[PDB]
Short mmCIF file of C-alpha atoms and ligand atoms in Angstrom, two decimals:
data_model
loop_
_atom_site.label_atom_id
_atom_site.label_comp_id
_atom_site.label_asym_id
_atom_site.label_seq_id
_atom_site.Cartn_x
_atom_site.Cartn_y
_atom_site.Cartn_z
CA UNK A 2 -151.41 7.88 153.41
CA UNK A 3 -151.56 6.39 156.96
CA UNK A 4 -153.95 3.70 158.23
CA UNK A 5 -154.67 1.78 161.30
CA UNK A 6 -155.83 -1.85 161.88
CA UNK A 7 -159.43 -1.34 162.35
CA UNK A 8 -162.38 -3.16 161.16
CA UNK A 9 -165.86 -1.71 159.97
CA UNK A 10 -169.36 -2.91 158.58
CA UNK A 11 -168.64 -3.96 155.00
CA UNK A 12 -171.13 -4.01 152.12
CA UNK A 13 -171.45 -6.26 149.20
CA UNK A 14 -171.79 -6.23 145.51
CA UNK A 15 -172.62 -8.64 142.75
CA UNK A 16 -173.94 -8.90 139.03
CA UNK A 17 -176.98 -10.62 140.12
CA UNK A 18 -179.47 -10.72 137.31
CA UNK A 19 -182.87 -9.71 138.38
CA UNK A 20 -185.82 -11.71 137.25
CA UNK A 21 -183.69 -14.86 137.80
CA UNK A 22 -184.89 -17.48 140.27
CA UNK A 23 -181.35 -18.45 141.23
CA UNK A 24 -181.47 -18.15 145.08
CA UNK A 25 -178.11 -16.66 144.94
CA UNK A 26 -179.18 -14.16 142.31
CA UNK A 27 -182.28 -13.21 144.03
CA UNK A 28 -180.21 -12.73 147.42
CA UNK A 29 -177.69 -10.58 145.84
CA UNK A 30 -180.56 -8.58 144.05
CA UNK A 31 -181.80 -7.43 147.47
CA UNK A 32 -178.73 -7.43 149.71
CA UNK A 33 -175.91 -6.35 147.39
CA UNK A 34 -175.39 -3.27 145.13
CA UNK A 35 -174.71 -3.23 141.40
CA UNK A 36 -170.98 -3.79 140.94
CA UNK A 37 -168.50 -0.69 140.54
CA UNK A 38 -168.54 0.11 136.82
CA UNK A 39 -165.24 1.75 137.08
CA UNK A 40 -163.25 0.54 140.14
CA UNK A 41 -159.45 1.18 140.30
CA UNK A 42 -156.35 0.45 142.32
CA UNK A 43 -153.38 2.45 143.45
CA UNK A 44 -150.15 0.51 144.02
CA UNK A 45 -148.72 1.71 147.42
CA UNK A 46 -145.23 2.46 146.32
CA UNK A 47 -142.58 0.87 148.56
CA UNK A 48 -144.86 -0.77 151.17
CA UNK A 49 -144.77 -3.52 153.80
CA UNK A 50 -148.21 -4.24 155.11
CA UNK A 51 -148.96 -7.05 157.61
CA UNK A 52 -152.10 -9.10 156.75
CA UNK A 53 -152.93 -11.82 159.20
CA UNK A 54 -155.52 -13.68 157.28
CA UNK A 55 -156.13 -16.19 160.29
CA UNK A 56 -157.41 -13.15 162.35
CA UNK A 57 -159.53 -10.89 159.97
CA UNK A 58 -163.07 -9.43 160.14
CA UNK A 59 -163.75 -9.61 156.37
CA UNK A 60 -164.12 -13.41 156.56
CA UNK A 61 -166.36 -13.35 159.60
CA UNK A 62 -168.74 -10.79 157.68
CA UNK A 63 -168.71 -12.95 154.83
CA UNK A 64 -169.62 -15.85 157.23
CA UNK A 65 -172.74 -14.19 158.49
CA UNK A 66 -173.44 -13.23 154.90
CA UNK A 67 -173.55 -16.92 153.70
CA UNK A 68 -175.29 -17.75 156.89
CA UNK A 69 -178.12 -15.44 155.97
CA UNK A 70 -177.96 -16.25 152.31
CA UNK A 71 -178.51 -19.95 152.93
CA UNK A 72 -180.96 -19.34 155.63
CA UNK A 73 -183.49 -17.69 153.48
CA UNK A 74 -182.58 -19.89 150.35
CA UNK A 75 -181.86 -23.51 151.24
CA UNK A 76 -184.60 -24.07 153.60
CA UNK A 77 -185.23 -27.59 155.10
CA UNK A 78 -188.57 -29.18 155.46
CA UNK A 79 -187.56 -29.74 159.04
CA UNK A 80 -184.97 -28.11 161.29
CA UNK A 81 -183.65 -29.50 164.49
CA UNK A 82 -181.70 -26.81 166.04
CA UNK A 83 -181.26 -27.17 170.00
CA UNK A 84 -184.32 -27.89 171.55
CA UNK A 85 -186.90 -27.18 168.72
CA UNK A 86 -188.55 -28.86 165.76
CA UNK A 87 -189.00 -26.18 163.09
CA UNK A 88 -191.24 -27.67 160.45
CA UNK A 89 -191.78 -25.72 157.01
CA UNK A 90 -192.00 -25.96 153.22
CA UNK A 91 -188.85 -27.32 151.09
CA UNK A 92 -189.79 -26.70 147.38
CA UNK A 93 -186.76 -27.54 145.23
CA UNK A 94 -184.97 -24.42 144.14
CA UNK A 95 -182.32 -23.20 141.80
CA UNK A 96 -178.78 -23.38 143.44
CA UNK A 97 -175.39 -22.32 141.90
CA UNK A 98 -173.16 -19.86 143.58
CA UNK A 99 -172.12 -16.55 141.94
CA UNK A 100 -169.37 -14.08 142.86
CA UNK A 101 -169.71 -11.70 145.75
CA UNK A 102 -167.68 -8.65 146.14
CA UNK A 103 -166.79 -6.86 149.55
CA UNK A 104 -166.63 -3.07 149.44
CA UNK A 105 -165.35 -0.57 152.24
CA UNK A 106 -167.47 2.41 153.18
CA UNK A 107 -165.89 5.85 152.78
CA UNK A 108 -163.13 6.41 155.28
CA UNK A 109 -161.91 2.94 154.93
CA UNK A 110 -160.16 0.80 152.15
CA UNK A 111 -159.15 -2.74 151.41
CA UNK A 112 -155.40 -3.58 151.39
CA UNK A 113 -154.58 -6.39 148.78
CA UNK A 114 -151.38 -8.16 148.76
CA UNK A 115 -150.27 -8.90 145.17
CA UNK A 116 -147.28 -10.91 146.39
CA UNK A 117 -147.85 -14.29 144.59
CA UNK A 118 -145.88 -16.09 147.25
CA UNK A 119 -148.19 -14.83 150.05
CA UNK A 120 -149.01 -17.45 152.68
CA UNK A 121 -151.45 -15.45 154.66
CA UNK A 122 -149.56 -14.44 157.75
CA UNK A 123 -146.40 -12.31 157.71
CA UNK A 124 -145.60 -9.03 156.00
CA UNK A 125 -146.29 -8.44 152.29
CA UNK A 126 -144.24 -5.99 150.08
CA UNK A 127 -146.47 -5.54 147.00
CA UNK A 128 -149.42 -3.97 148.57
CA UNK A 129 -152.24 -2.63 146.59
CA UNK A 130 -155.15 -0.64 147.40
CA UNK A 131 -158.89 -1.33 146.31
CA UNK A 132 -162.25 -0.27 147.70
CA UNK A 133 -163.87 -3.85 146.66
CA UNK A 134 -162.40 -7.26 146.88
CA UNK A 135 -162.81 -9.48 143.58
CA UNK A 136 -165.60 -11.57 142.62
CA UNK A 137 -165.97 -14.57 145.24
CA UNK A 138 -168.04 -17.49 144.98
CA UNK A 139 -169.36 -18.78 148.33
CA UNK A 140 -168.85 -22.52 147.73
CA UNK A 141 -169.82 -24.58 150.90
CA UNK A 142 -167.79 -27.84 151.09
CA UNK A 143 -165.67 -30.09 153.18
CA UNK A 144 -161.96 -31.67 152.40
CA UNK A 145 -161.98 -30.21 148.99
CA UNK A 146 -162.11 -26.54 148.03
CA UNK A 147 -164.05 -26.02 144.65
CA UNK A 148 -164.68 -23.29 142.24
CA UNK A 149 -162.06 -20.78 143.59
CA UNK A 150 -159.01 -18.93 142.59
CA UNK A 151 -155.64 -20.77 142.42
CA UNK A 152 -152.02 -19.90 143.49
CA UNK A 153 -150.31 -17.71 140.86
CA UNK A 154 -147.15 -19.88 141.26
CA UNK A 155 -145.95 -22.46 143.63
CA UNK A 156 -148.56 -24.39 145.76
CA UNK A 157 -148.74 -22.55 149.05
CA UNK A 158 -149.89 -23.88 152.43
CA UNK A 159 -151.47 -21.62 154.86
CA UNK A 160 -151.78 -21.97 158.42
CA UNK A 161 -152.46 -20.22 161.72
CA UNK A 162 -149.34 -22.16 163.15
CA UNK A 163 -148.12 -25.20 161.42
CA UNK A 164 -146.59 -26.53 164.61
CA UNK A 165 -150.00 -26.52 166.36
CA UNK A 166 -151.81 -29.82 165.09
CA UNK A 167 -155.33 -28.53 165.53
CA UNK A 168 -154.78 -25.38 163.58
CA UNK A 169 -156.11 -26.26 160.26
CA UNK A 170 -153.85 -26.52 157.22
CA UNK A 171 -155.00 -24.99 153.98
CA UNK A 172 -153.45 -25.88 150.57
CA UNK A 173 -153.73 -23.28 147.76
CA UNK A 174 -153.13 -25.49 144.41
CA UNK A 175 -151.52 -23.66 141.46
CA UNK A 176 -153.55 -25.79 138.80
CA UNK A 177 -156.98 -27.07 138.64
CA UNK A 178 -157.92 -30.72 139.07
CA UNK A 179 -161.56 -30.90 137.68
CA UNK A 180 -164.06 -33.27 139.53
CA UNK A 181 -167.26 -34.44 137.74
CA UNK A 182 -170.15 -35.52 139.97
CA UNK A 183 -173.60 -37.08 138.73
CA UNK A 184 -176.73 -38.65 139.74
CA UNK A 185 -177.97 -40.29 136.64
CA UNK A 186 -181.77 -40.13 135.91
CA UNK A 187 -184.23 -42.92 135.68
CA UNK A 195 -181.93 -45.92 144.03
CA UNK A 196 -182.02 -42.17 143.44
CA UNK A 197 -179.55 -41.23 146.37
CA UNK A 198 -176.68 -43.18 144.67
CA UNK A 199 -174.37 -40.67 142.85
CA UNK A 200 -170.61 -40.68 141.99
CA UNK A 201 -167.74 -38.26 141.03
CA UNK A 202 -165.22 -38.91 138.30
CA UNK A 203 -161.57 -37.40 138.80
CA UNK A 204 -158.88 -38.16 136.43
CA UNK A 205 -156.46 -40.09 138.31
CA UNK A 206 -153.18 -38.87 136.56
CA UNK A 207 -153.87 -35.25 137.22
CA UNK A 208 -154.87 -35.84 140.90
CA UNK A 209 -151.84 -37.99 141.65
CA UNK A 210 -149.40 -35.73 139.92
CA UNK A 211 -150.67 -32.71 141.77
CA UNK A 212 -150.91 -34.60 145.02
CA UNK A 213 -147.19 -35.43 144.41
CA UNK A 214 -146.53 -31.55 144.08
CA UNK A 215 -148.51 -31.01 147.19
CA UNK A 216 -146.66 -33.80 149.02
CA UNK A 217 -143.22 -32.27 148.04
CA UNK A 218 -144.15 -28.88 149.28
CA UNK A 219 -145.68 -30.13 152.60
CA UNK A 220 -142.31 -31.74 153.10
CA UNK A 221 -140.68 -28.46 152.46
CA UNK A 222 -142.35 -26.95 155.46
CA UNK A 223 -142.03 -29.94 157.82
CA UNK A 224 -138.28 -30.74 157.76
CA UNK A 225 -138.29 -33.30 154.72
CA UNK A 226 -140.20 -35.74 157.05
CA UNK A 227 -142.12 -38.79 155.71
CA UNK A 228 -145.35 -37.50 154.12
CA UNK A 229 -148.49 -39.67 154.29
CA UNK A 230 -152.12 -38.71 153.38
CA UNK A 231 -154.72 -41.01 155.04
CA UNK A 232 -158.53 -40.81 155.49
CA UNK A 233 -159.88 -39.01 158.55
CA UNK A 234 -159.96 -40.52 162.02
CA UNK A 235 -163.47 -40.33 162.99
CA UNK A 236 -166.27 -37.79 162.80
CA UNK A 237 -169.64 -37.35 160.99
CA UNK A 238 -170.11 -37.82 157.31
CA UNK A 239 -169.66 -34.06 156.69
CA UNK A 240 -166.12 -34.16 158.07
CA UNK A 241 -165.30 -37.68 156.62
CA UNK A 242 -166.82 -37.24 153.25
CA UNK A 243 -166.26 -34.47 150.65
CA UNK A 244 -169.64 -32.83 151.21
CA UNK A 245 -171.04 -30.18 149.00
CA UNK A 246 -174.08 -28.77 147.40
CA UNK A 247 -174.92 -29.39 143.76
CA UNK A 248 -178.12 -27.95 142.37
CA UNK A 249 -179.58 -27.87 145.82
CA UNK A 250 -178.73 -31.63 146.71
CA UNK A 251 -176.10 -32.46 149.38
CA UNK A 252 -173.67 -34.84 147.93
CA UNK A 253 -171.45 -36.74 150.28
CA UNK A 254 -168.38 -38.24 148.42
CA UNK A 255 -166.17 -40.92 150.07
CA UNK A 256 -162.83 -39.66 148.87
CA UNK A 257 -160.80 -42.42 150.33
CA UNK A 258 -159.20 -43.25 147.04
CA UNK A 259 -157.42 -39.88 146.82
CA UNK A 260 -155.90 -40.05 150.32
CA UNK A 261 -154.97 -43.68 150.27
CA UNK A 262 -154.32 -44.99 146.75
CA UNK A 263 -150.80 -43.53 147.24
CA UNK A 264 -149.75 -43.88 143.74
CA UNK A 265 -146.70 -41.78 144.10
CA UNK A 272 -147.68 -44.04 138.47
CA UNK A 273 -151.40 -45.12 138.89
CA UNK A 274 -153.63 -43.75 135.93
CA UNK A 275 -157.29 -44.06 135.15
CA UNK A 276 -160.22 -42.03 135.66
CA UNK A 277 -161.15 -42.69 139.34
CA UNK A 278 -164.92 -42.93 140.15
CA UNK A 279 -165.79 -41.95 143.66
CA UNK A 280 -168.97 -43.17 145.50
CA UNK A 281 -171.44 -40.72 146.78
CA UNK A 282 -174.84 -40.36 148.43
CA UNK A 283 -177.26 -37.71 148.24
CA UNK A 284 -177.98 -37.01 151.99
CA UNK A 285 -181.32 -35.45 153.24
CA UNK A 286 -180.78 -35.15 157.17
CA UNK A 287 -177.49 -33.12 157.31
CA UNK A 288 -175.64 -31.72 160.24
CA UNK A 289 -175.39 -28.07 159.63
CA UNK A 290 -172.71 -25.79 159.20
CA UNK A 291 -174.14 -22.64 160.11
CA UNK A 292 -174.87 -23.86 163.61
CA UNK A 293 -175.26 -27.12 165.47
CA UNK A 294 -178.36 -28.84 164.36
CA UNK A 295 -179.85 -31.36 161.93
CA UNK A 296 -181.60 -30.20 158.70
CA UNK A 297 -183.97 -32.41 156.78
CA UNK A 298 -184.74 -31.54 153.10
CA UNK A 299 -186.72 -33.53 150.71
CA UNK A 300 -185.76 -36.26 148.34
CA UNK A 301 -183.76 -35.36 145.15
CA UNK A 302 -185.40 -34.35 141.79
CA UNK A 303 -186.03 -36.72 138.92
CA UNK A 304 -183.28 -36.25 136.53
CA UNK A 305 -179.48 -35.89 135.66
CA UNK A 306 -177.96 -34.10 138.69
CA UNK A 307 -174.60 -33.04 137.52
CA UNK A 308 -171.93 -30.58 138.71
CA UNK A 309 -168.34 -30.25 137.23
CA UNK A 310 -166.11 -28.34 139.51
CA UNK A 311 -162.50 -27.23 139.94
CA UNK A 312 -160.54 -28.44 143.00
CA UNK A 313 -158.47 -25.39 143.77
CA UNK A 314 -157.50 -26.27 147.45
CA UNK A 315 -157.42 -28.83 150.15
CA UNK A 316 -158.36 -28.77 153.92
CA UNK A 317 -155.85 -30.83 155.68
CA UNK A 318 -155.44 -31.63 159.60
CA UNK A 319 -152.20 -33.12 160.85
CA UNK A 320 -151.87 -35.93 163.43
CA UNK A 321 -150.35 -34.80 166.84
CA UNK A 322 -147.86 -37.04 168.53
CA UNK A 323 -145.52 -37.61 165.77
CA UNK A 324 -142.54 -35.71 167.36
CA UNK A 325 -140.72 -38.79 167.97
CA UNK A 326 -141.34 -40.62 164.72
CA UNK A 327 -140.28 -40.61 161.10
CA UNK A 328 -143.53 -39.41 159.52
CA UNK A 329 -146.22 -36.75 159.58
CA UNK A 330 -149.77 -37.79 158.51
CA UNK A 331 -152.43 -35.41 157.18
CA UNK A 332 -156.16 -36.36 156.92
CA UNK A 333 -158.33 -34.10 154.90
CA UNK A 334 -160.77 -31.90 157.14
CA UNK A 335 -163.13 -28.98 157.07
CA UNK A 336 -166.33 -28.16 158.43
CA UNK A 337 -165.51 -24.73 159.36
CA UNK A 338 -166.64 -22.67 156.37
CA UNK A 339 -164.92 -19.62 157.75
CA UNK A 340 -161.78 -21.39 156.59
CA UNK A 341 -163.37 -21.80 153.08
CA UNK A 342 -163.83 -18.07 152.92
CA UNK A 343 -160.34 -17.25 154.41
CA UNK A 344 -159.01 -19.37 151.43
CA UNK A 345 -159.98 -16.45 148.98
CA UNK A 346 -159.87 -13.23 151.27
CA UNK A 347 -156.32 -14.13 152.44
CA UNK A 348 -155.07 -11.19 150.16
CA UNK A 349 -157.21 -8.58 151.62
CA UNK A 350 -157.07 -6.26 154.70
CA UNK A 351 -159.32 -3.56 156.11
CA UNK A 352 -157.78 -0.14 156.91
CA UNK A 353 -159.27 2.98 158.45
CA UNK A 354 -157.78 6.09 157.24
CA UNK A 355 -156.39 7.50 160.31
C1 Z1I B 401 -170.63 -23.59 165.54
C2 Z1I B 401 -170.12 -24.84 164.74
C3 Z1I B 401 -171.36 -25.52 164.26
N1 Z1I B 401 -170.70 -26.68 163.11
C4 Z1I B 401 -170.94 -27.99 163.28
O1 Z1I B 401 -171.30 -28.39 164.08
N2 Z1I B 401 -170.41 -29.06 162.30
C5 Z1I B 401 -170.60 -30.51 162.52
C6 Z1I B 401 -171.19 -31.35 161.50
C7 Z1I B 401 -170.82 -32.70 161.79
N3 Z1I B 401 -170.91 -32.99 163.33
C8 Z1I B 401 -170.52 -30.82 160.18
C9 Z1I B 401 -170.63 -29.27 159.95
C10 Z1I B 401 -170.43 -29.20 158.41
O2 Z1I B 401 -169.34 -28.84 158.08
N4 Z1I B 401 -171.62 -29.18 157.74
C11 Z1I B 401 -171.88 -29.21 156.13
C12 Z1I B 401 -173.08 -29.21 155.84
C13 Z1I B 401 -173.52 -29.01 154.20
C14 Z1I B 401 -172.32 -28.81 153.39
CL1 Z1I B 401 -172.82 -28.71 151.70
C15 Z1I B 401 -171.08 -28.74 153.90
F1 Z1I B 401 -170.09 -28.60 153.08
C16 Z1I B 401 -170.86 -28.97 155.34
C17 Z1I B 401 -169.77 -28.71 160.92
C18 Z1I B 401 -170.08 -25.91 161.96
C19 Z1I B 401 -168.94 -25.38 162.62
C20 Z1I B 401 -168.06 -24.48 161.67
N5 Z1I B 401 -169.20 -24.36 163.83
C21 Z1I B 401 -168.01 -23.88 164.36
C1 NAG B 402 -147.09 -5.69 142.10
O1 NAG B 402 -148.28 -6.16 141.86
C2 NAG B 402 -149.06 -5.37 140.78
C3 NAG B 402 -150.41 -5.90 140.64
O2 NAG B 402 -150.39 -6.73 139.45
C4 NAG B 402 -148.10 -5.30 139.52
O3 NAG B 402 -147.88 -4.06 139.28
C5 NAG B 402 -146.95 -6.17 139.57
O4 NAG B 402 -147.35 -7.60 139.66
C6 NAG B 402 -146.21 -5.88 140.80
N1 NAG B 402 -145.41 -4.75 140.62
C7 NAG B 402 -143.90 -4.61 140.54
C8 NAG B 402 -143.27 -3.25 140.28
O5 NAG B 402 -143.38 -5.82 140.65
C1 NAG B 403 -145.63 -17.35 156.11
O1 NAG B 403 -144.51 -16.30 155.60
C2 NAG B 403 -143.97 -15.71 156.68
C3 NAG B 403 -143.07 -14.57 156.06
O2 NAG B 403 -142.42 -15.07 154.78
C4 NAG B 403 -143.08 -16.61 157.55
O3 NAG B 403 -142.54 -16.11 158.57
C5 NAG B 403 -144.12 -17.72 158.07
O4 NAG B 403 -143.25 -18.76 158.64
C6 NAG B 403 -144.86 -18.29 156.99
N1 NAG B 403 -145.84 -19.32 157.40
C7 NAG B 403 -146.04 -20.45 156.86
C8 NAG B 403 -147.15 -21.31 157.50
O5 NAG B 403 -145.49 -20.79 155.73
C1 NAG B 404 -147.02 -25.86 140.89
O1 NAG B 404 -146.11 -25.67 142.15
C2 NAG B 404 -145.08 -26.84 142.28
C3 NAG B 404 -144.40 -26.50 143.55
O2 NAG B 404 -144.81 -27.33 144.58
C4 NAG B 404 -144.36 -26.80 141.01
O3 NAG B 404 -143.31 -27.92 141.18
C5 NAG B 404 -145.15 -26.87 139.85
O4 NAG B 404 -144.43 -26.88 138.58
C6 NAG B 404 -146.23 -25.88 139.81
N1 NAG B 404 -147.09 -26.24 138.53
C7 NAG B 404 -147.86 -25.10 138.11
C8 NAG B 404 -148.66 -25.47 136.89
O5 NAG B 404 -147.77 -23.89 138.44
C1 NAG B 405 -143.87 -31.98 169.92
O1 NAG B 405 -145.15 -31.68 169.11
C2 NAG B 405 -145.46 -30.42 168.63
C3 NAG B 405 -146.57 -30.56 167.91
O2 NAG B 405 -147.82 -30.57 168.48
C4 NAG B 405 -144.30 -29.91 167.90
O3 NAG B 405 -144.55 -28.48 167.35
C5 NAG B 405 -143.01 -29.77 168.88
O4 NAG B 405 -141.83 -29.44 167.95
C6 NAG B 405 -142.57 -31.22 169.49
N1 NAG B 405 -141.53 -31.03 170.20
C7 NAG B 405 -140.32 -30.81 170.11
C8 NAG B 405 -139.35 -30.81 171.19
O5 NAG B 405 -139.98 -30.84 168.76
C1 NAG B 406 -147.52 -22.52 167.74
O1 NAG B 406 -147.93 -23.68 168.40
C2 NAG B 406 -146.95 -24.25 169.31
C3 NAG B 406 -147.52 -25.68 169.56
O2 NAG B 406 -148.27 -25.69 170.80
C4 NAG B 406 -147.00 -23.26 170.54
O3 NAG B 406 -145.98 -23.87 171.37
C5 NAG B 406 -146.42 -21.84 169.93
O4 NAG B 406 -146.62 -20.96 171.02
C6 NAG B 406 -147.41 -21.43 168.69
N1 NAG B 406 -147.02 -20.13 168.35
C7 NAG B 406 -147.71 -19.03 168.66
C8 NAG B 406 -147.20 -17.79 167.96
O5 NAG B 406 -148.84 -19.10 169.26
C1 NAG B 407 -161.40 -24.44 136.17
O1 NAG B 407 -159.93 -24.18 135.87
C2 NAG B 407 -159.47 -23.84 134.56
C3 NAG B 407 -158.18 -23.75 134.47
O2 NAG B 407 -157.55 -23.44 135.70
C4 NAG B 407 -160.25 -22.16 134.21
O3 NAG B 407 -160.05 -21.95 132.91
C5 NAG B 407 -161.68 -22.45 134.38
O4 NAG B 407 -162.24 -21.07 134.23
C6 NAG B 407 -162.08 -22.91 135.87
N1 NAG B 407 -163.44 -23.04 135.98
C7 NAG B 407 -164.21 -22.31 136.80
C8 NAG B 407 -165.81 -22.74 136.81
O5 NAG B 407 -163.90 -21.65 137.55
C1 NAG B 408 -168.99 -35.93 133.43
O1 NAG B 408 -169.55 -37.24 133.74
C2 NAG B 408 -170.68 -37.48 132.85
C3 NAG B 408 -171.37 -38.92 133.31
O2 NAG B 408 -170.18 -39.79 133.38
C4 NAG B 408 -170.40 -37.32 131.33
O3 NAG B 408 -171.51 -37.61 130.64
C5 NAG B 408 -169.77 -36.19 130.96
O4 NAG B 408 -169.33 -36.14 129.86
C6 NAG B 408 -168.38 -35.88 131.96
N1 NAG B 408 -167.94 -34.60 131.71
C7 NAG B 408 -166.93 -34.23 132.09
C8 NAG B 408 -166.26 -32.92 131.63
O5 NAG B 408 -165.89 -35.10 132.54
C1 NAG B 409 -165.18 -45.03 152.17
O1 NAG B 409 -164.80 -46.26 151.46
C2 NAG B 409 -163.99 -47.17 151.82
C3 NAG B 409 -163.83 -48.17 150.96
O2 NAG B 409 -163.22 -47.60 149.67
C4 NAG B 409 -164.45 -47.70 153.32
O3 NAG B 409 -163.48 -48.37 153.70
C5 NAG B 409 -164.63 -46.41 154.22
O4 NAG B 409 -165.02 -46.97 155.43
C6 NAG B 409 -165.52 -45.41 153.64
N1 NAG B 409 -165.82 -44.20 154.52
C7 NAG B 409 -166.96 -43.83 155.00
C8 NAG B 409 -166.91 -42.65 155.64
O5 NAG B 409 -167.94 -44.30 154.62
C1 NAG B 410 -157.42 -47.29 152.79
O1 NAG B 410 -156.48 -47.21 153.94
C2 NAG B 410 -157.03 -48.44 154.86
C3 NAG B 410 -156.21 -48.30 156.08
O2 NAG B 410 -156.57 -47.14 156.95
C4 NAG B 410 -156.70 -49.75 154.16
O3 NAG B 410 -157.02 -50.81 155.01
C5 NAG B 410 -157.42 -49.62 152.80
O4 NAG B 410 -157.04 -50.75 151.98
C6 NAG B 410 -157.14 -48.36 151.96
N1 NAG B 410 -157.93 -48.37 150.74
C7 NAG B 410 -157.30 -48.24 149.51
C8 NAG B 410 -158.31 -48.25 148.33
O5 NAG B 410 -156.02 -48.29 149.48
C1 NAG B 411 -168.78 -24.92 140.02
O1 NAG B 411 -168.95 -24.08 138.89
C2 NAG B 411 -169.64 -24.90 137.89
C3 NAG B 411 -169.57 -23.84 136.83
O2 NAG B 411 -170.36 -22.63 137.12
C4 NAG B 411 -170.99 -25.06 138.44
O3 NAG B 411 -171.66 -25.88 137.33
C5 NAG B 411 -170.88 -26.06 139.51
O4 NAG B 411 -172.24 -26.53 139.91
C6 NAG B 411 -170.01 -25.46 140.59
N1 NAG B 411 -169.86 -26.39 141.86
C7 NAG B 411 -170.38 -26.05 142.99
C8 NAG B 411 -170.04 -27.06 144.08
O5 NAG B 411 -171.00 -25.04 143.23
CL1 CL B 412 -169.78 1.05 144.35
#
């Protein structure tokens, strides 16, 4: 037994198929090791460990991991970062995230909270020790979290301080709302995303309930964001290499607390995009000729709350995002790094 809250350089694992041109595949083929063919866990009997997912070095290590991954893979024709115009080649590539496992070196271990109620901060009683996290897809996106794991029971909200406005609010859903995005083959930047309205509005009503639970049963209202760049104000994501910007006004505004129908969302495949790895503009080439389609699972929501609602009857939440650290911190929440002191 015995351990101390210390962080150390981590390594990565994956099932990257060699001789596949998937950029994720070819990054994990040269930067990660083959997955543990026999891993195992040891329930720490009678334990109470304190993970603080909002402050954790695992996520930052993952961050630079995806920064590098994307840097050598998704490479723009032109890159305008600070005072510099980087011109290079931009062949259209293969793109579809694959799970990445994080794995401690000898002397350290990973503490996994198996309490299904776990919100991220605060002590956990079902602790459980593993040398590698689980398989995690590094999906880059704003507002909506896609292709991730879901809460084992109730919908859980995670925050670094609910009270504080700026401190992002993350919503971990307990069931999957599928979203289906397409660019039909022969305007080529016009795209759209189908999302079944009954599903969405029902779960949104479950969220809104729990949201109320954490906030003194105040009036719950989900409005579209209050200014920002497209990235922030539009569900942005990358499908097959293309950057979809989808105008999710319907979801946070149709307020059908019975609506029904299969909602169809407008989208634009953006070329010049404000980056997420760092301040700058990246201009890629036009999309490819053909049916560009991705069907993903909505497994979370990035929320930000309005400030001066102290002396009022309501609390307004607008979808946010932009910090992809929070995206990672949505899956690593149940993981801690311990040095064996
Ligand atoms: C050091 C800063 C730099 N930075 C940033 O400047 N922006 C501003 C820009 C709008 N102004 C939106 C950035 C963003 O999310 N982009 C993005 C791109 C592609 C896809 Cl597919 C996606 F889903 C999202 C976030 C990222 C931030 C975390 N970081 C702290
Ligand atoms: C604690 O979590 C582990 C992981 O699955 C499992 O044994 C069970 O869910 C929990 N154990 C007990 C004794 O409740
Ligand atoms: C998270 O759970 C801990 C312990 O149950 C509690 O003290 C804290 O207020 C919770 N935070 C949120 C944002 O629910
Ligand atoms: C999800 O959690 C909510 C609590 O907000 C609960 O009402 C609902 O039944 C749960 N659904 C599933 C499928 O777990
Ligand atoms: C004033 O607003 C903050 C949110 O920014 C809130 O946490 C605080 O409780 C409010 N003040 C009072 C006295 O409730
Ligand atoms: C949470 O946010 C409120 C709002 O500013 C602040 O007064 C309080 O100190 C914060 N809590 C912590 C533990 O920092
Ligand atoms: C989407 O969610 C369903 C049910 O929650 C699950 O069975 C399926 O594997 C998920 N798809 C992906 C790609 O994760
Ligand atoms: C997704 O949308 C496309 C075009 O509308 C359609 O052909 C396909 O059947 C849809 N699939 C799902 C799972 O919604
Ligand atoms: C999204 O579409 C709505 C119309 O449904 C429009 O009012 C709003 O300005 C659009 N938002 C953005 C960021 O284009
Ligand atoms: C979205 O909200 C705005 C107010 O911010 C309103 O003008 C507009 O009608 C709403 N859109 C829908 C589709 O309800
Ligand atoms: C989510 O996973 C599905 C199945 O692997 C994939 O087709 C889709 O492109 C993924 N979505 C994103 C945004 O990566
Ligand atoms: Cl190993």
